Amino acid sequence: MKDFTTYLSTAPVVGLGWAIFTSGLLIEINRFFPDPLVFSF
Amino acid sequence: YGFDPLGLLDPSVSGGKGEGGFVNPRWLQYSEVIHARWAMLGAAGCIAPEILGKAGVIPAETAVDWFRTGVIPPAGVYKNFWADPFTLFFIEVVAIQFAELKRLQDYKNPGSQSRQYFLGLEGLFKGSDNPAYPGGPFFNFANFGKTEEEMKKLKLNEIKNGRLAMLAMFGYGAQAVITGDGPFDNLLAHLADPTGNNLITNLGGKFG
Amino acid sequence: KVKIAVDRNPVETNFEKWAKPGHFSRALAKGPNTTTWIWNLHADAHDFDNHTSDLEEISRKVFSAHFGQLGIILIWLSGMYFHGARFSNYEGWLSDPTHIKPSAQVVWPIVGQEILNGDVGGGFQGIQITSGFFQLWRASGITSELQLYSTAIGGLVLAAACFFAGWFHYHKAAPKLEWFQNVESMLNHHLAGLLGLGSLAWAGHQIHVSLPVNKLLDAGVDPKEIPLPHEFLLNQSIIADLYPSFSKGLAPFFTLNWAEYSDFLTFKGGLNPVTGGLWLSDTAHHHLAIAVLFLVAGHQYRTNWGIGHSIKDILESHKGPFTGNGHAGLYEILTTSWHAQLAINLALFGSLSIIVAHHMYAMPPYPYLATDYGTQLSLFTHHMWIGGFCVVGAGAHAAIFMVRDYDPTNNYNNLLDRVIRHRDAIISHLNWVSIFLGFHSFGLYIHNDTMSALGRPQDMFSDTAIQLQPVFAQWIQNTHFTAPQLTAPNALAATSLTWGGDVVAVGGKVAMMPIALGTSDFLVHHIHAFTIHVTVLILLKGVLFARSSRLIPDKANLGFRFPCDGPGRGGTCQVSAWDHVFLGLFWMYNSLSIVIFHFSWKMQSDVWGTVTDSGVSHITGGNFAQSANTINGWLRDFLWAQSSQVIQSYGSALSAYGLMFLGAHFVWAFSLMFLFSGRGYWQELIESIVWAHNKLRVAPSIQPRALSITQGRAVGVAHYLLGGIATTWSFFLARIIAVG
Amino acid sequence: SFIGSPTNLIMVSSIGACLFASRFGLAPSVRKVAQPLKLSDREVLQTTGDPAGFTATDVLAMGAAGHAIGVGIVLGLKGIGQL
Amino acid sequence: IPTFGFLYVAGYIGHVGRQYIILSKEDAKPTDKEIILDVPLALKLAFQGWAWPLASIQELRNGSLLEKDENITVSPR
Amino acid sequence: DRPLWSPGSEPPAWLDGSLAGDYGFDPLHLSEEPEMRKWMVQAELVHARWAMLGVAGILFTSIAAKTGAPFPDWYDAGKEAIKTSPAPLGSLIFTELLLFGWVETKRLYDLRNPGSQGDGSFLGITDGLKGKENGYPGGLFDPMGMSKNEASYKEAKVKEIKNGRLAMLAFVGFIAQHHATHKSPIDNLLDHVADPFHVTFATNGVSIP
Ligand code: CLA
Ligand code: CLA
Ligand code: CLA
Ligand code: CLA
Ligand code: CLA
Ligand code: SF4
């Protein structure tokens, strides 16, 4: 696991984990909430 | 017997370190005798209900062609069983997965199945130097093959009858697909009219 | 002599080399001091020649690389089958192929994408697909989505098996070098075994499965009550009524009475009028003949049993006097260089993909494929581009072999040495014929443009004015039309309706109609010949001058991919063979773009259209005959007369095609930054940005560096090709879906 | 393939001629490697019985050749108006 | 308000990147930390960047935000 | 040296037998690092205890429904429970979230720092709320306290982990044959003992096409 978790801390932790997290996050804000234009809380 | 035209028993094949690949003499002999014993059991069980059904030894309502017992439900499935064929399949999977995985674990480590407790059956599960030839208090429960000369004679006889059962099961499947009836029916057809009932005539017939 | 030489466990299976990304190269094994280390990591990743000098390790690496690519392709194919099984209207399309548009991709309702789920018919909404998978799944007998699910699961299982095979055949039991060097055994097993066995298996599947399903499908029988193919396989009675030859039951095969099989192994010309595709019996006899022809061809070479052909003997035996030594050292070259084999295989694969594109636009081999103009156009263009890319890669890897794997000691007076010897003559004559073709293929267009602009249409190179009639192509068309009459009397009709005289039409839309060739077709075909001649000139000059040149005699020691030799001798920029290939990508792009523009305009103006009771009306009113003689006519009547649906696609199902169009415009335009510019300006700008990040101490530990000159050229050509390909893709698909 | 049918006779004669030719030279067999005029009389494996290089691979190759030649002759004669 | 809403996240990203850059440059052979990320420390800085403007302001005030040109690579014009 | 998950196999080096239920089954090399080993042990024990609790509750409700009490199925029990619950949905889950946040942060910081919660910070409890082992607390969690004897404690550890793994398998079986049969687990058990030769996982229609 040590050798595997050393590899998993390379490019996919920043290129895939951040990308998937930020993407799917934003997808769910755009899904559960409709399309906004004015920040009226 | 020296019949190796292609060449797969060369020690130069799979040379080096590690557990390696399947093309090696040890695994080849192991799988040869395993295919031999399985083919002999299959050749016994394919034609054993047929002869006893023609002779009326066992009830003919149970005596059916080997491919119509439920192995190929397109060909036929026997309804009058104590369980559905898939239930028997799951029983088969559990039991023979246990058996073949114990065989594989002993193949990787010889004698290792006699160390881990298995219902007090570790005495039977030791094996010999050849993983193909375990022996012991169960696999050779009758001593029978004790002296090395008659042991090697029994080895040659077993491998020869298994090599015969290779072609026997091959012909069983081939006759089953070209004709659609049992192998003993094909034997009776060849005996009654050899020229009218052979390969040449049957290839130009129905269902083949 | 031929045996299975395998080394067991040469490489341990662990993640030790996964932790360190730079491990294949000793130069990249130290660390990423500069930002060019990452680009060198992703660039020299699969270059196995400089990883190690042993051919055995390279052979094992490429063997498992091919296994991984096979697993990836099987994963993608299984995914397509799963999409057809789950998100598709294939069941609806089977009951109405002429009125329901195919669809196999369903988007999510997340943000505005509900407009992309267009009304394709059959109570289904989704992306109108263009790969023609519904036509393929109608050719091979497939009725329900359950069979597609089973195919997808089997494809996933085979992909997992292929990946496990790559892992085993590299890490666990790796073959030796002599195993890979058994060329005769490889050729025999991939001629008789792979190609021949696959052709026989597909012929058997077509005979026992596809033929009855397709015979019941075009007869008006609903697919719900069509019997499953295992019923045809097991019961001879059901297959006997559709084909009476099955009642004999393999008797005519062994008695040489094959004429009795003339009901489902027919020899018919043209297309099936009900569906518009080729007859399935013709394809069955075709694949059976191909299987026989490849099975006899796979027993040619000598491997282990004395008989056969020795390839080295065949090569060394063909020696003709004007060539000195003939094929003397080619066997040793192709048994020791992976790159020469890669070049040959890539060239033939690309050419055969070109043949595939031509021979499936001409003869549609799938039911309801000719009337589906989008699938035919997309298939032709896609295999066009794949073949062109493979040919350019063949030139590239030939140049790589020339730089690296070439040795002058083995070959002295062979064909290859004499090819290097007279390379200046070849390049000069190719340049001459390239310039001649350019003048007498493009100055004709410019002259027609001028006389149109000078108000003199009678001076044109057109049909109404003085003309260049393609007499040879028309004569070949007439010969092939009259070929079933005399030279092939057993053929029912012509092999294709390109040269025929009948207009087949399915669902009121023209499946395939005869093609008339005129002056404009002559001009465009000679433009194609010019463009291909220039591209092959560039690629062959890159291959020939890769070793040495009159400018730089030591170009071999500089490697294959080097940016330049400095501004000496006036400036030797782009002198490497890699940059010759880099220009070849653009020239192949121009060639194939003009080719697919010709295809789209010619089909939409003279083949594709809707048949009426009073004549036949095309998609465009025959504008190719009177408008393809001038560049301005080409522009206005093809790129402006069309593409009006791409710009007006907003608010509709094809708005994503307009988005793809403008994004492709962006990517094509963004490439010219990497193409016109150099590295020093960008390096100085990066130095200023490094100063800016140094002022407030956000300097990265890895020093930011500009992209290399070869790296910059690669980025520029990749973005240029991506932008152009996606531009043509969006324009073609939107035009052919909104109209056809 | 009926006994006495002309196609049966043609393939029987073709297979017999292909087997009999390679028995005594007259063919590029296993023992006879082939030049443009097919010489040099080599030896590999064993004949297993009857003399002259003629093993299992030899009978398989020559039988395949004879079957192919007979099939070609039969279908050609069918095409050109004969049997 | 969405201007400050974007600026908060932008300063968050810049501040956590700066914190990772300083905390990586003080480590032996620091060039590998950019290609071989560490997840615990980057996540610790990721959940410590909420008060990015206060940390940026205090770092500007104490002078550790900026660096003396004397120690900055300067083009020789 | 000990019974393994496969007879004649090689146990992992990090699985030396010191843990409860250490049969050496680890083909994916998880819990190799000691910190990750402790985290995996804690996760296994908490998943185990929740599995035995949930399976026991499911079995009790199903048995009571079989006797004749108005008890729902193990599935959709909360759907009809909220209609008669004084606590509405939302408030219930957030109260559970707050309480479980307190408890699970306490036990997590006891896992990272052993004995950290036994400092008397929470209501002045020193000996209680202080961990005894990796995933095994003590004090207030051991009222009767039959874990004092080391041999009995080890035997109870092995019993707990084995019944817990059986509880994981029981919950997976519960959801699987509920999706297969749409009936209670006690209903499936009574159907299996009534007609064993025919009623099984193969003749339920679904899951075997
Ligand atoms: C590779 C392609 C392929 C395949 C798989 C088949 C398969 C089949 N064809 Mg077809 N056929 C093909 C190509 C193919 N054909 C071509 C190219 C033509 C020329 C046009 C034909 C023309 C044709 C006709 C005209 C007819 C068939 C028929 C048949 C069926 C009868 C089988 C038979 O005659 O031989 C089977 C004989 C054998 C000796 C095969 C032996 C194989 C068995 C399974 C071996 C089993 C051994 C096993 C290891 C031991 C048992 C295992 C146990 C444990 C389970 C069969 C399903 C007939 C049909 O439809 O009948 C229903 C029929 O009338 N075929
Ligand atoms: C008749 C036997 C046979 C067959 C069918 C094949 C088939 C193939 N070989 Mg070849 N090969 C053979 C014998 C054979 N080989 C021999 C004897 C040698 C040594 C002289 C080689 C040496 C060789 C090399 C060096 C390479 C291949 C490759 C390939 C693949 C080419 C890719 C392609 O066309 O897509 C067709 C793709 C498919 C049909 C997908 C299905 C693939 C299935 C799973 C493969 C099954 C065929 C296999 C021989 C079955 C036995 C394997 C068994 C141990 C399980 C193809 C699968 C390339 C490769 O690596 O790909 C694997 C490659 O680079 N071959
Ligand atoms: C049969 C297929 C085949 C095979 C086995 C090889 C194998 C090889 N080639 Mg060849 N090549 C091929 C086809 C093939 N090539 C084709 C078709 C072309 C024409 C484009 C080339 C052009 C080519 C050149 C010009 C060079 C090679 C080189 C190489 C070597 C290393 C390649 C590498 O590491 O790339 C690394 C892998 C990548 C960089 C990934 C590719 C990503 C590209 C740039 C973009 C793809 C984008 C995609 C299409 C769409 C995505 C859009 C985006 C928004 C996500 C290796 C010997 C190089 C070498 O040194 O040879 C010894 C070299 O200089 N090849
Ligand atoms: C459409 C844009 C375009 C055009 C027209 C040209 C034109 C040319 N390039 Mg180029 N090329 C271009 C873009 C273009 N390039 C780009 C972007 C690249 C980068 C990848 C290249 C890469 C490249 C390579 C790698 C090669 C060329 C070559 C050529 C020549 C081909 C000669 C030929 O057959 O054509 C015929 C000539 C023309 C089309 C020029 C216009 C002539 C018109 C019809 C007018 C006719 C003459 C006129 C009447 C006289 C007017 C007299 C007046 C002054 C009074 C020619 C000079 C090749 C070469 O050197 O020759 C084979 C070559 O090897 N180019
Ligand atoms: C987090 C690290 C970081 C920080 C604090 C800065 C800060 C700065 N950069 Mg730099 N930059 C970075 C990374 C960073 N950059 C990277 C990775 C690149 C390569 C794409 C650049 C490329 C770049 C250029 C080309 C320019 C700047 C400029 C600037 C200045 C303007 C502020 C701004 O938003 O620029 C805009 C910054 C970008 C567009 C880069 C965005 C890239 C992402 C957001 C950075 C990802 C880093 C990552 C999240 C950190 C890891 C987190 C950690 C927990 C693991 C400022 C001094 C400008 C300047 O000189 O003004 C004085 C300028 O012209 N930067
Ligand atoms: S401009 Fe660039 S490619 Fe050209 S000679 Fe100078 S350094 Fe080399």
PDB file of N, CA and C in Angstrom, chain B residues 81-84 86-87 89-90 101-102 105-106 109 112-113 116-118, chain F residues 2-10 196-198 200-203 208-209:
ATOM      1  N   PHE B  81     -36.245 -34.289 -11.183  1.00  0.00           N
ATOM      2  CA  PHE B  81     -35.109 -34.244 -10.280  1.00  0.00           C
ATOM      3  C   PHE B  81     -35.554 -33.735  -8.915  1.00  0.00           C
ATOM      4  N   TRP B  82     -34.758 -34.056  -7.893  1.00  0.00           N
ATOM      5  CA  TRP B  82     -35.080 -33.605  -6.544  1.00  0.00           C
ATOM      6  C   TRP B  82     -34.866 -32.105  -6.386  1.00  0.00           C
ATOM      7  N   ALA B  83     -34.036 -31.506  -7.235  1.00  0.00           N
ATOM      8  CA  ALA B  83     -33.786 -30.074  -7.195  1.00  0.00           C
ATOM      9  C   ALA B  83     -33.715 -29.537  -8.614  1.00  0.00           C
ATOM     10  N   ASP B  84     -33.886 -28.225  -8.733  1.00  0.00           N
ATOM     11  CA  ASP B  84     -33.727 -27.567 -10.022  1.00  0.00           C
ATOM     12  C   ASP B  84     -32.261 -27.635 -10.452  1.00  0.00           C
ATOM     13  N   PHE B  86     -30.191 -25.469 -11.494  1.00  0.00           N
ATOM     14  CA  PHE B  86     -29.346 -24.392 -10.989  1.00  0.00           C
ATOM     15  C   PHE B  86     -28.994 -24.597  -9.520  1.00  0.00           C
ATOM     16  N   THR B  87     -29.900 -25.202  -8.747  1.00  0.00           N
ATOM     17  CA  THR B  87     -29.588 -25.548  -7.361  1.00  0.00           C
ATOM     18  C   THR B  87     -28.478 -26.592  -7.303  1.00  0.00           C
ATOM     19  N   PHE B  89     -26.370 -26.956  -9.654  1.00  0.00           N
ATOM     20  CA  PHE B  89     -25.197 -26.241 -10.142  1.00  0.00           C
ATOM     21  C   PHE B  89     -24.498 -25.488  -9.020  1.00  0.00           C
ATOM     22  N   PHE B  90     -25.262 -24.860  -8.124  1.00  0.00           N
ATOM     23  CA  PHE B  90     -24.653 -24.157  -6.996  1.00  0.00           C
ATOM     24  C   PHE B  90     -23.998 -25.134  -6.026  1.00  0.00           C
ATOM     25  N   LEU B 101      -9.806 -26.057  -5.400  1.00  0.00           N
ATOM     26  CA  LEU B 101      -8.943 -25.078  -4.752  1.00  0.00           C
ATOM     27  C   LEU B 101      -7.997 -25.747  -3.761  1.00  0.00           C
ATOM     28  N   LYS B 102      -8.449 -26.811  -3.085  1.00  0.00           N
ATOM     29  CA  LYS B 102      -7.520 -27.604  -2.279  1.00  0.00           C
ATOM     30  C   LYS B 102      -6.460 -28.256  -3.159  1.00  0.00           C
ATOM     31  N   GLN B 105      -3.999 -25.486  -4.166  1.00  0.00           N
ATOM     32  CA  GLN B 105      -3.149 -25.083  -3.051  1.00  0.00           C
ATOM     33  C   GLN B 105      -2.112 -26.150  -2.732  1.00  0.00           C
ATOM     34  N   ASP B 106      -2.470 -27.428  -2.885  1.00  0.00           N
ATOM     35  CA  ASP B 106      -1.473 -28.483  -2.741  1.00  0.00           C
ATOM     36  C   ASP B 106      -0.503 -28.493  -3.918  1.00  0.00           C
ATOM     37  N   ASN B 109       1.950 -25.647  -3.074  1.00  0.00           N
ATOM     38  CA  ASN B 109       2.752 -26.079  -1.927  1.00  0.00           C
ATOM     39  C   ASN B 109       2.449 -27.537  -1.625  1.00  0.00           C
ATOM     40  N   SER B 112       0.837 -29.190   1.872  1.00  0.00           N
ATOM     41  CA  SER B 112       0.361 -28.093   2.705  1.00  0.00           C
ATOM     42  C   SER B 112      -1.071 -28.283   3.181  1.00  0.00           C
ATOM     43  N   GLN B 113      -1.854 -29.124   2.509  1.00  0.00           N
ATOM     44  CA  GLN B 113      -3.233 -29.356   2.916  1.00  0.00           C
ATOM     45  C   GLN B 113      -3.346 -30.293   4.111  1.00  0.00           C
ATOM     46  N   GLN B 116      -3.237 -27.488   7.675  1.00  0.00           N
ATOM     47  CA  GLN B 116      -4.408 -26.746   8.117  1.00  0.00           C
ATOM     48  C   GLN B 116      -5.563 -27.708   8.363  1.00  0.00           C
ATOM     49  N   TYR B 117      -6.249 -27.514   9.491  1.00  0.00           N
ATOM     50  CA  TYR B 117      -7.278 -28.451   9.927  1.00  0.00           C
ATOM     51  C   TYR B 117      -8.474 -28.442   8.981  1.00  0.00           C
ATOM     52  N   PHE B 118      -8.857 -29.635   8.505  1.00  0.00           N
ATOM     53  CA  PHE B 118     -10.021 -29.796   7.631  1.00  0.00           C
ATOM     54  C   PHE B 118     -10.763 -31.065   8.067  1.00  0.00           C
TER      55      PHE B 118
ATOM     56  N   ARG F   2      -1.184 -20.907  12.363  1.00  0.00           N
ATOM     57  CA  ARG F   2      -2.556 -20.550  12.685  1.00  0.00           C
ATOM     58  C   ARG F   2      -3.433 -20.895  11.491  1.00  0.00           C
ATOM     59  N   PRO F   3      -4.728 -21.127  11.702  1.00  0.00           N
ATOM     60  CA  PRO F   3      -5.628 -21.354  10.562  1.00  0.00           C
ATOM     61  C   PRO F   3      -5.750 -20.105   9.700  1.00  0.00           C
ATOM     62  N   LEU F   4      -5.521 -20.276   8.403  1.00  0.00           N
ATOM     63  CA  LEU F   4      -5.555 -19.184   7.445  1.00  0.00           C
ATOM     64  C   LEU F   4      -6.841 -19.235   6.633  1.00  0.00           C
ATOM     65  N   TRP F   5      -7.096 -18.150   5.897  1.00  0.00           N
ATOM     66  CA  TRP F   5      -8.264 -18.094   5.028  1.00  0.00           C
ATOM     67  C   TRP F   5      -8.163 -19.074   3.867  1.00  0.00           C
ATOM     68  N   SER F   6      -6.949 -19.442   3.470  1.00  0.00           N
ATOM     69  CA  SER F   6      -6.722 -20.464   2.464  1.00  0.00           C
ATOM     70  C   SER F   6      -5.707 -21.451   3.026  1.00  0.00           C
ATOM     71  N   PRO F   7      -6.017 -22.749   3.044  1.00  0.00           N
ATOM     72  CA  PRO F   7      -5.054 -23.730   3.560  1.00  0.00           C
ATOM     73  C   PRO F   7      -3.821 -23.808   2.670  1.00  0.00           C
ATOM     74  N   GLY F   8      -2.650 -23.704   3.296  1.00  0.00           N
ATOM     75  CA  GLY F   8      -1.399 -23.745   2.570  1.00  0.00           C
ATOM     76  C   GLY F   8      -0.959 -22.437   1.958  1.00  0.00           C
ATOM     77  N   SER F   9      -1.684 -21.350   2.201  1.00  0.00           N
ATOM     78  CA  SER F   9      -1.301 -20.056   1.668  1.00  0.00           C
ATOM     79  C   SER F   9      -0.223 -19.416   2.538  1.00  0.00           C
ATOM     80  N   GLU F  10       0.282 -18.275   2.073  1.00  0.00           N
ATOM     81  CA  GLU F  10       1.275 -17.508   2.813  1.00  0.00           C
ATOM     82  C   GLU F  10       0.617 -16.280   3.418  1.00  0.00           C
ATOM     83  N   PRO F 196     -37.044 -27.154   1.214  1.00  0.00           N
ATOM     84  CA  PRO F 196     -35.628 -26.927   0.893  1.00  0.00           C
ATOM     85  C   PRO F 196     -35.241 -27.385  -0.496  1.00  0.00           C
ATOM     86  N   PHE F 197     -35.876 -28.438  -1.013  1.00  0.00           N
ATOM     87  CA  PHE F 197     -35.452 -29.019  -2.280  1.00  0.00           C
ATOM     88  C   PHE F 197     -35.845 -28.165  -3.476  1.00  0.00           C
ATOM     89  N   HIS F 198     -36.824 -27.277  -3.323  1.00  0.00           N
ATOM     90  CA  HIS F 198     -37.308 -26.464  -4.432  1.00  0.00           C
ATOM     91  C   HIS F 198     -37.130 -24.974  -4.193  1.00  0.00           C
ATOM     92  N   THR F 200     -35.311 -21.921  -3.178  1.00  0.00           N
ATOM     93  CA  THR F 200     -33.916 -21.555  -2.972  1.00  0.00           C
ATOM     94  C   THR F 200     -33.657 -20.243  -3.703  1.00  0.00           C
ATOM     95  N   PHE F 201     -32.379 -19.906  -3.874  1.00  0.00           N
ATOM     96  CA  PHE F 201     -31.997 -18.685  -4.571  1.00  0.00           C
ATOM     97  C   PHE F 201     -32.137 -18.791  -6.083  1.00  0.00           C
ATOM     98  N   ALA F 202     -32.422 -19.980  -6.612  1.00  0.00           N
ATOM     99  CA  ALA F 202     -32.515 -20.183  -8.050  1.00  0.00           C
ATOM    100  C   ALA F 202     -33.940 -20.148  -8.577  1.00  0.00           C
ATOM    101  N   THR F 203     -34.928 -20.477  -7.746  1.00  0.00           N
ATOM    102  CA  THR F 203     -36.323 -20.531  -8.162  1.00  0.00           C
ATOM    103  C   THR F 203     -37.124 -19.343  -7.640  1.00  0.00           C
ATOM    104  N   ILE F 208     -31.694 -15.126 -11.293  1.00  0.00           N
ATOM    105  CA  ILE F 208     -31.349 -16.300 -12.090  1.00  0.00           C
ATOM    106  C   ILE F 208     -32.274 -16.260 -13.300  1.00  0.00           C
ATOM    107  N   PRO F 209     -31.820 -15.739 -14.448  1.00  0.00           N
ATOM    108  CA  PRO F 209     -32.678 -15.594 -15.629  1.00  0.00           C
ATOM    109  C   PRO F 209     -33.005 -16.918 -16.319  1.00  0.00           C
TER     110      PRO F 209
END
